[PDB]
Amino acid sequence: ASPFRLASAGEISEVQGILRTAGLLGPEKRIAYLGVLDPARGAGSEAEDRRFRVFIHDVSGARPQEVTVSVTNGTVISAVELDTAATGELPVLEEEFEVVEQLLATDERWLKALAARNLDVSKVRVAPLSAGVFEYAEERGRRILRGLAFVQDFPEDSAWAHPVDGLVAYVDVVSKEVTRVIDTGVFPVPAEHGNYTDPELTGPLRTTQKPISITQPEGPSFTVTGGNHIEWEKWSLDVGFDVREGVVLHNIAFRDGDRLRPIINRASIAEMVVPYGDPSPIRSWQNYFDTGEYLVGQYANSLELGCDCLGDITYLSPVISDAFGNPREIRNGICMHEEDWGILAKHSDLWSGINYTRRNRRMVISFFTTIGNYDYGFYWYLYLDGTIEFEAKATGVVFTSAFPEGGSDNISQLAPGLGAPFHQHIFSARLDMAIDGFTNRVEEEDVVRQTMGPGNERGNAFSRKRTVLTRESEAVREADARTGRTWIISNPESKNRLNEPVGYKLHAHNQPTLLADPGSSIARRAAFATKDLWVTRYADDERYPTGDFVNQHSGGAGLPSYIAQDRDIDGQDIVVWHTFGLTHFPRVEDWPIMPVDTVGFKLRPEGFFDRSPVLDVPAN
Amino acid sequence: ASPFRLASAGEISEVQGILRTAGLLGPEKRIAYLGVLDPARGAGSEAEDRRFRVFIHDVSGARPQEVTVSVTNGTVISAVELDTAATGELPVLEEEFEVVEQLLATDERWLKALAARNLDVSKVRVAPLSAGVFEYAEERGRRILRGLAFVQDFPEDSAWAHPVDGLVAYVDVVSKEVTRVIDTGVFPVPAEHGNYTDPELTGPLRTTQKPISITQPEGPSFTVTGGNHIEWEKWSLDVGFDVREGVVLHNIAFRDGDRLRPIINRASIAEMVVPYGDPSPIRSWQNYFDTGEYLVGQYANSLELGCDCLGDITYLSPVISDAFGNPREIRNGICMHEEDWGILAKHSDLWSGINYTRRNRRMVISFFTTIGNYDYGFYWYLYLDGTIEFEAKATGVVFTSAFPEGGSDNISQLAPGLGAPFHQHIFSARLDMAIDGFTNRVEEEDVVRQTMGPGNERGNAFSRKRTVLTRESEAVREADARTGRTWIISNPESKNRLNEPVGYKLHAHNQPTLLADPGSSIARRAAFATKDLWVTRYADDERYPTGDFVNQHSGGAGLPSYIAQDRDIDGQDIVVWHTFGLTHFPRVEDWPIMPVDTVGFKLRPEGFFDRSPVLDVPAN
Numbered sequence A, B: 001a002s003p004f005r006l007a008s009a010g011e012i013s014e015v016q017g018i019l020r021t022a023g024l025l026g027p028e029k030r031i032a033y034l035g036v037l038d039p040a041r042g043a044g045s046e047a048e049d050r051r052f053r054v055f056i057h058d059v060s061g062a063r064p065q066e067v068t069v070s071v072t073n074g075t076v077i078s079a080v081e082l083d084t085a086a087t088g089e090l091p092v093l094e095e096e097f098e099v100v101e102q103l104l105a106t107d108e109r110w111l112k113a114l115a116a117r118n119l120d121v122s123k124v125r126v127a128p129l130s131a132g133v134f135e136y137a138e139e140r141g142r143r144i145l146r147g148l149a150f151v152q153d154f155p156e157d158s159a160w161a162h163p164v165d166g167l168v169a170y171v172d173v174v175s176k177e178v179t180r181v182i183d184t185g186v187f188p189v190p191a192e193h194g195n196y197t198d199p200e201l202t203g204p205l206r207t208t209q210k211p212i213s214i215t216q217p218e219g220p221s222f223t224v225t226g227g228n229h230i231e232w233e234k235w236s237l238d239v240g241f242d243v244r245e246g247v248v249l250h251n252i253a254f255r256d257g258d259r260l261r262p263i264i265n266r267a268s269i270a271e272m273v274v275p276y277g278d279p280s281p282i283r284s285w286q287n288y289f290d291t292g293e294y295l296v297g298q299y300a301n302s303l304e305l306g307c308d309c310l311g312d313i314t315y316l317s318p319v320i321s322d323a324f325g326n327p328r329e330i331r332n333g334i335c336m337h338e339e340d341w342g343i344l345a346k347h348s349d350l351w352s353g354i355n356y357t358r359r360n361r362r363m364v365i366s367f368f369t370t371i372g373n374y375d376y377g378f379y380w381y382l383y384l385d386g387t388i389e390f391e392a393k394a395t396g397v398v399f400t401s402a403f404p405e406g407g408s409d410n411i412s413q414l415a416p417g418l419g420a421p422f423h424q425h426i427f428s429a430r431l432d433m434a435i436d437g438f439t440n441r442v443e444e445e446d447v448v449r450q451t452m453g454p455g456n457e458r459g460n461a462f463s464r465k466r467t468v469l470t471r472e473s474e475a476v477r478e479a480d481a482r483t484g485r486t487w488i489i490s491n492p493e494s495k496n497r498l499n500e501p502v503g504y505k506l507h508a509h510n511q512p513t514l515l516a517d518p519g520s521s522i523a524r525r526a527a528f529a530t531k532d533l534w535v536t537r538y539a540d541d542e543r544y545p546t547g548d549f550v551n552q553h554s555g556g557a558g559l560p561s562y563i564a565q566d567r568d569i570d571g572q573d574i575v576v577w578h579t580f581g582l583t584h585f586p587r588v589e590d591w592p593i594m595p596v597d598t599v600g601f602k603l604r605p606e607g608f609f610d611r612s613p614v615l616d617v618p619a620n
C-alpha cells in the first residue's frame, strides 16, 4: 500500500504494454532508462498514482523521447521528443558495449594499426567509453563512443594487463561509422599477465586463516514490512532502488518517545565522475559518469552469502526493465544486516563506584556495482546514537596504459612497461533534508581562535561562529579543515528543551575536489565537483547535480543552473548536495587487483535530542 | 628469552629489594614512575641487561630522584637528585587524589565558601587537577594541585551533574598548605541529576536488541609466544606495556616471502593533552596531560568478556609497581582479537567471465583507561593488506561548569543551569620508523594542479610533488587537506622490483591542532600540539614530545629542544611524531554520559611490496 514500495515485475510489464499500445515501443526503440517517480510534495490526499519516467532511444536515428506513464490509470501522461544537440544524449545502452569492438574489427584504419603491432584482431578487446564534449564539431547531435584497446591472450585472461597505447578510435554507434582512428605511435604491449587467480602469481594459498562465525541465534533485530519498510532500534525508513542512482533511502525517521521525528526525506548518491589526469591525447578526453552516463543500478551484482555479505542477511531483489521493457530481477542485489560496532559508551567513576559499559551496533544497507574495470560498494549505516553514515568502497582493476620510457608526471608504474594514469573518483550525495519537518536552514560552523588580551588574559580561549546561508547564491561552500569547518542543518521552528533549534551536523572528510583546470570541459560538465557543499531550494525536477542527460552534454546543466534562481533557503524545504571523493595516485599494491579504499561522510545529531538517545540500551 | 618481554612480578620485586638495600626506599619515599628500558641500538651482542627507570618522590620535602637499576646484575646503575624548579615536578601520585579534598575540608576559607552556598562539606567532592605554570611566583619548585568542586547528593550520585562554579583552590600537597582560595561569586549548583543508570532517566530498557554471536570454532588465527610475541597473517610484533604510555608496539614486521621485513621499530602514544578554552579564571589554567602528568597505563581498566571485548579474546595481564614497589597485576588489561572487516577485494570481469571476492580482516590490540571523568580506548589495528591504523575512542563524562545566565561564547549548555566548557583532546603518536631497516627519509607529498595550456591543451592534467625533509630544522610540518598533503617514509637504499624506494604513506585526519594563543603557557608546554608532523633523528633519551617531567614544567622541553640540534634526517635512523586531535564543542547528546567519538591515523604501503600482498588470501 505504501507509495514508496519497490517497482514490481507487474508494474514494469504494464508500462511496456502501455508504451507498446501507444505506438512508442516498436522494433527500433530501446528503453535507456526506466524508473518510478517519487510522490509529489503533500501526498496526504490519499490519491496514489504510480508513475514511471522512461527514456526511449531509437536505433534508426529518429529523435529519442521522454515519456511519463501512469500504471494506476494505464495512460501516457506526457511524451516529448528530445533535441539531443541541445539537451544531451541518452545514457549508454548495455547492448552498445559490444558494438564499438565490432565496428572497429572491420575498419581498415583500425586493422592497419593492429597489424603494425602484430596483434590478432580476435584477441583485441575494446572498452566502450563515453565521449564527453570537446573540439570535434561533427560530434554535436550524434551518439559517439570512444574506444581504447586491450589484448586478451586467452579467453580467461585479464585484458587490463595488456593495454594498447598510442591508439584510440571514435565511433558513431547509430550510423555505425568509425569517424576517426588516431595512432600516435607504437608502444610495447605490456607482457606480464595480471591473472590474480593463477597459482603462478598467487603462490600457495594461506592455510593460516581460521573461520570467524557471525550468527544471530534469535534472528535479526530489524523488521521488514511491505517489501521494503525497515524498522530498527527506533529508526524507520523505506529502501528504494533506481536503475540510475542505485539504492535510495526514503523517509528516514527516528522514534523519540512517542513521536516519529523525520530527519531526511530522500538520500541518494545522485552522480559520480571519474576524471583522468593524463594529458596524452589517447586519454585526455576520458571522464566517465558511472551514475549519469551508464546507470550504476543496472550493473548491481548478485551478492553471495558468506562471501559478499556475512552474518544474518536479509536480501532485497529489486526489479528493473531491460531494453525492451521486460522486467528483470536482480537476485539478492541489496544486503541488509546489523553489525556489532564496539563500545558505545563507557565510564568507571571514582566517586560513585559505578562501572558502566554499553555496546554499539549499526544497521548496514549495501549494494555492489561493476562497470567495466571498476567495482564499487555503496554502504549506508544507521547507528544506535542517531548518526547516519555513507561509505563508498572502491576496488576492481585500475585502468591502465603503457608506462613511457623516461617516466611520466601523470602516470604511475605498476609493472614493467605498465602504467596507471592518475585520476579521481568523485561522488555527489543528494540529501533532501527534513529535520523535524521541512522548514530547514543550513549554517556553516567555523572554529574561532582568539587573541591573548583583555577578557582572555591567559590566551587559552577559543570559540566558534555560525553563518546562516540565506539564499542559493551564497550557498556554494568550500571545505576548510584547518578551521574545523562543518555544516549544521537545523529547524528554526523546532526547539529542544533548552530552547535551541534542533539540528544535525554534517562532517566531511575534506578530501580534494575536482583538480582539472576550471576552463576545462570536465569542469563545466561536472561543475558540482568543484565545490564541497551546495544548498538548493527543493523542486520536483531538480534531481541530478549534472542534469537529466549527462552523456555528451556541453556543460552548465544541473547545480550551476539551479542556484542561478537565487531562491530563499532560510527556513525552507531545502536539499543539501555534498561532493566528496578520492584522488588516486595508483601504487604497486593496487596491481593486479585493488584492495578496497574508502571515502564517505556522516551526519551526527546536534541538539536534536534532549539528552543522549541511547540511555535505554541494555547491558547485554 | 626475548629482551622485549613484559615486566614480571619477580623483576619488580627485585627492583624494590635493590632500591631498599641501597637506602633509596625508606618510609618517606614513593615510586611515582617505574618502567623497563628498551634495549639500546645494536643489541646484537646477545648481552641481555634488563634495566628499569624509577622516579622516586619524597613526601617530606627532600629532593626527588631519578634512578636506573639493573635487575640482571642487581645493582643501582645511576641515581640523580632532581631540581624540580629547573626540570619539572614528578607525575601526580594516585594517593594525592584524596589529599586535595581532605586539606580543603579543614581550611576556613574553603568552609566559608561552602557555607555561603549551603553545601555540606561531607557531600563536596574535589577534583585533583594539575596546576600548570602561570603567574604565581610562590609555586615555583613546589608541588601544587588545583581543586574544583562537585556535589554528590548521595554516595552513588554522579557528582559531575553538580559543579560548584565560581570557586577554585590551590594546594601544596607536600607542605599540606592551602595557598589560595578564589571565590568569584555564587552560581546556582545545577540541580538535575545525571545518573545514567536511574530508571527515571533511562526509561524502560529496550527489549528489541537480539543477540549477535561472534565465535571462532577453531580458535583464533594468531599465536602468542613468550608471553607477548604475536604472529598473525604474516605480521609479527611484540606487545609491551608501560605505566606512562600504556600499550607499546615493538618490532612491527611483515613476512614477505622468506624475508621478515621491518616496518616500525617502536609505536606508542607518547603524550596527550586536554586544553580547555574557557577564559573564566575558575578554569583558564586547566590543561591536563593524561599521559605525561597522570600516567595513563596505571589507570587501565580490567576488560570484561562479552562487554568490553567481544569474540574469541586473548588477554594480557601486565604488571606494574604500586607506590611502594610492590608488583600489581592489571588483570585482563589488554584485549587481543581478530575481526572480520568486510570486503578486501572484488571484481567481476566482463571479458574473462571471472567473478572474484575476498574478505578482509584486522587484528585488534586495545586497552581502556579512566582518569577522573574521562575514559579512553586505545586501539591498534593491523590489516591483511599491510595497513596499520591507530584509533582513540573518547567517552566518559564531559567536564562541567555552570551555564551563565545570558550565555557564553566558550561553554555549551547541556541541561538547565549546566555547562560544558569547550576543549580539545590532542594526542602525539611517536613512530620510531624502520622501513626495511633503519636508513629512512620522510617526503611531503602534495597534489599539483596544472594550468590549461601547451602540453595540457584540454586542462585535465594533474600531478604530485614530493619534498625530501633533510634536516630537523625543516621537518616541522603542517597539514594541508586542500592539497591532499600526505607524508611518505621511505628507505632510499631498499628498492622494489621497479627500482623505486620502498615506502609507507601516512594519512592524517587533518583535524585542527592546538587553538590556544601561541603566547600562552599551554602553547609553550604543549608545543608539539601546534604542528601536525615532526621528524627527529633517533636518540635514546628523546622519549616524549613534552620531556620527561611534564608536571609544572615551565615550557620548551621536548620536541622544540630536540629539533634545535638540526640533525641530518636524510637516510638516517629517524622518529616521526604525529599530532592529531578532536576539538570538542559539547552537544546535548553528550550528556549525561558521552557516546564514543573517535580520531586517529593510518599508514598504508606505498611501493613497499612488488604487487598486492593479499593475492594468497583464500576464498573462504
Ligand SMILES: O=CCc1ccccc1
Pocket: A127, A128, A129, A130, A288, A290, A294, A371, A372, A373, A374
Ligand atoms: O566506468 C565506465 C567506463 C568503462 C565502461 C566499460 C568498460 C571500461 C570502462
Ligand SMILES: O=CCc1ccccc1
Pocket: B127, B128, B129, B130, B288, B290, B294, B371, B372, B373, B374
Ligand atoms: O584527567 C586528569 C584530570 C582529572 C583527574 C581526576 C579527576 C578529574 C579530572
Ligand SMILES: [Cu+2]
Pocket: A398, A423, A424, A425, A584
Ligand atoms: Cu582509482
Ligand SMILES: [Cu+2]
Pocket: B398, B423, B424, B425, B584
Ligand atoms: Cu571532549
Ligand code: NA
Pocket: A085, A086, A087, A088, A553, A554
Ligand atoms: Na548544448
Ligand code: NA
Pocket: A265, A432, A433, A434, A438, A538, A572, A573, A574, A575
Ligand atoms: Na527538504
Ligand code: NA
Pocket: B085, B086, B087, B088, B553, B554
Ligand atoms: Na624551569
Ligand code: NA
Pocket: B265, B432, B433, B434, B438, B538, B572, B573, B574, B575
Ligand atoms: Na628509526
